[PDB]
Design a binder for this molecule. Structure first.
Ligand SMILES: O=C(O)[C@H](O)C[C@@H](O)CCCO
Ligand SMILES: C[C@H](O)[C@H](O)C[C@@H](O)C(=O)O
Ligand SMILES: [Mg+2]
Ligand SMILES: [Mg+2]
Lengths: 402, 402
């Protein structure tokens, strides 16, 4: 029998965010610099305001920054993970959650997870900031466990059900993505309800243009980042039907379950409606799944962690729905390669102009895998835990201790 | 016409919490000391764990502490409010929300509220910590506006619809509350699902005992603080029917809307099922209301603020449902005294043994009204804003600035 060490320490750091260096990248996808496609007039719940229409950074989409959680075993072996939470995330880990982590066996992952959810239920809001923090701890624990055992997380889960992961790319250049080998391209909408018919015409024209440039089989999708209402989303969906838009994503704020049910009913035949990247907790996904949307897209570092993601996958599978996680790099790779119902995955372009394969969490992860010709072979993931190391060269800050 | 000043500064402080003095009380109801009824073997989602069964403080119900938000107008007049968020709440106000507040007219309350919701949607989780912070800002704004205009918030809202507010008391001593003049007493359950039939027997016996001591007309209620499941809650509800328990509260975690619908259907005839203190955003309450529960109980400082509470009241009223806010002291008083569908209100005993009328938010609020003979006359609320001043004698800490 294999002997397992206990967890000795848990520590949290952060980079980027309102109290560090702006544009640090890493865990917080939106903590970028200037002239980045990911901040180029993207439609949001705030773009109806003139002062917040051109830039998401202007309303503060980058204030949190990156949270880094590292768990150390008694034998000095360590595991870690990153997510979006920054300094406040550090407070939660160092001043609250540490009590459930330290002293546990490295294999007590599900126990620690349940205790974190139970202990923070009174202030977690079942999603967002607090759940991002819990997710980061969960991932760090899986990483440590796999590194202690000497196995990649995907093998601990029951092995891969496919030899490689195929990706679609999210960014402003589906055409460049096709050249890179991706199977599809998801573009962000730039106009919203306040833009009316003109907004619909413009975003639909954007899709029409890429359809002409990419061909019929390369998938095209629209990401709406919680910026619409049912009527606008319905009009946009129908305006894009002629171009065989594969799916229209997150048209509504997360609490609007009833609206998603209506939107899905109104959707053009064969066109999928998706959401989920901002939802958290298994129970929320149960409610989301029952709205009838085609694909739920939890972010492994935001939905509650790998422990929760695996449950969401089972939920979707029981209903014949697909689960295609939001970004997440290796944290998603090790999970989805084992999911029969995750036939493809997402790669969110961190490259300012979507012309290069800059790593998903650049530069916080050392040796971070990137799709080559739109794919990541399972052999690439054949390393202990999630297979990466923390880039200690980054200016990590430790705001709290215990 | 009256001239209104612009908002010049917004500042956040905190007391209590994991990074200050434990047991500070104030905004965080649970940041108490030892031997307090509010921490006496209260059933929770964590009490199934032996190490966290006896005390909620042990699992960290007190790590956040009190958040204090003060908004200052150009004319030097100030308004403020308190809630549960502490240090992290300060980060959110000083490093993110300040951009939507400063520079606005003191009357731009609803605008600032919508911008706070839109700008934090990507990490707010629609409730909990972030929403508590937003609520605190909202309340501070109403306070400032009323103080600038020279009117109590309840008059700005459209006046009182009753001359006094009648209260029920939450605590371990319904009998002592009856002597104090309260119209009812809500007790916390001490056992949970893991305790099975014995747990049900014990909490039901507790209700039976108070029914014998208090008489038939004094109301009795059970608060279950998200600690049960549908079957346990159903059994407990039926076990308490013989004693005419008025309602059984928050039996399930907030995301379990489907469970609440089932619980309400299973409830004994005439017995009410309530929840809502941990829910946030108007949309969540729409979903909650549709489960059919009888009373929604948002906390003004957690649900999104006064701006949101007024909307929730309209939602409930449109359906014939009642809205009875969770604690909140003056922040609830000024709102509910104007609600036709809030016939009574709650006073959560901060007194360690529920024998005295220690102020709801003691000691952070100066001149904080307390029910006298179970009531608060509207004349008591006849002061600008929410009618109270910040107890600057407390050891307020300013972790962030901008
Ligand atoms: O699904 C995703 O990769 C994210 O939602 C992309 C998002 O950050 C860009 C805004 C699109 O409207
Ligand atoms: C005593 C209970 O656990 C809560 O702290 C009280 C709260 O839920 C209320 O409704 O007052
Ligand atoms: Mg998306
Ligand atoms: Mg309650």
């Amino acid at each position: 029998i294999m002997t397992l060490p206990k967890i000795k320490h848990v520590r949290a750091w952060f980079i980027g965010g309102a109290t560090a260096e702006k544009g640090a990248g890493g865990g917080d996808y939106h903590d970028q610099g200037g002239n980045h496609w990911i901040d180029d007039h993207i439609a949001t719940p705030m773009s109806k305001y003139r002062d917040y229409e051109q830039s998401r950074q202007s309303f503060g989409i980058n204030v949190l920054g990156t949270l880094i959680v590292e768990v150390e075993a008694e034998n000095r072996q360590t595991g870690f993970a990153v997510s979006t939470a920054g300094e406040m995330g550090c407070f939660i880990v160092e001043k609250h959650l540490n009590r459930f982590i330290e002293g546990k066996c490295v294999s007590d992952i599900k126990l620690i997870h349940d205790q974190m959810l139970g202990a923070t239920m009174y202030y977690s809001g079942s999603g967002g900031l607090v759940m991002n923090t819990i997710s980061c701890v969960d991932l760090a624990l899986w990483d440590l466990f796999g590194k202690v055992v000497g196995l990649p997380v995907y093998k601990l889960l029951g092995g891969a059900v496919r030899d490689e992961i195929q990706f679609y790319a999210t960014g402003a250049r589906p055409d460049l993505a096709k050249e890179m080998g991706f199977i599809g391209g998801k573009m962000p909408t730039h106009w919203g309800p306040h833009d009316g018919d003109a907004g619909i015409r413009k975003d639909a024209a954007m899709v029409a243009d890429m359809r002409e440039k990419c061909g019929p089989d390369f998938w095209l999708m629209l990401d709406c980042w919680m910026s619409q209402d049912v009527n606008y989303a319905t009009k946009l969906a129908h305006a894009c039907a002629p171009f065989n838009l594969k799916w229209i994503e997150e048209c509504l704020p997360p609490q609007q379950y009833e609206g998603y049910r209506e939107l899905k009913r109104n959707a053009p035949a064969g066109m999928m409606v998706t959401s989920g990247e901002h939802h958290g907790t298994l129970q929320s996904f149960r409610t989301l799944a029952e709205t009838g949307i085609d694909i739920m897209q939890p972010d492994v570092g935001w939905c509650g962690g790998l422990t929760t993601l695996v449950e969401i996958a089972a939920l979707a599978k029981s209903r014949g729905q697909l689960v295609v996680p939001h970004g997440s790099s290796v944290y998603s790779h090790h999970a989805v390669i084992t999911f029969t119902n995750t036939p493809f995955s997402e790669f969110l372009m961190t490259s300012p102009d979507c012309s290069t394969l800059r790593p998903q969490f650049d530069p916080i992860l050392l040796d971070e895998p990137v799709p080559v010709n739109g794919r990541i072979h399972k052999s690439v993931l054949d390393k202990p835990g999630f297979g990466v190391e923390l880039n200690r060269d980054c200016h990590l800050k430790r705001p709290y201790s215990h």
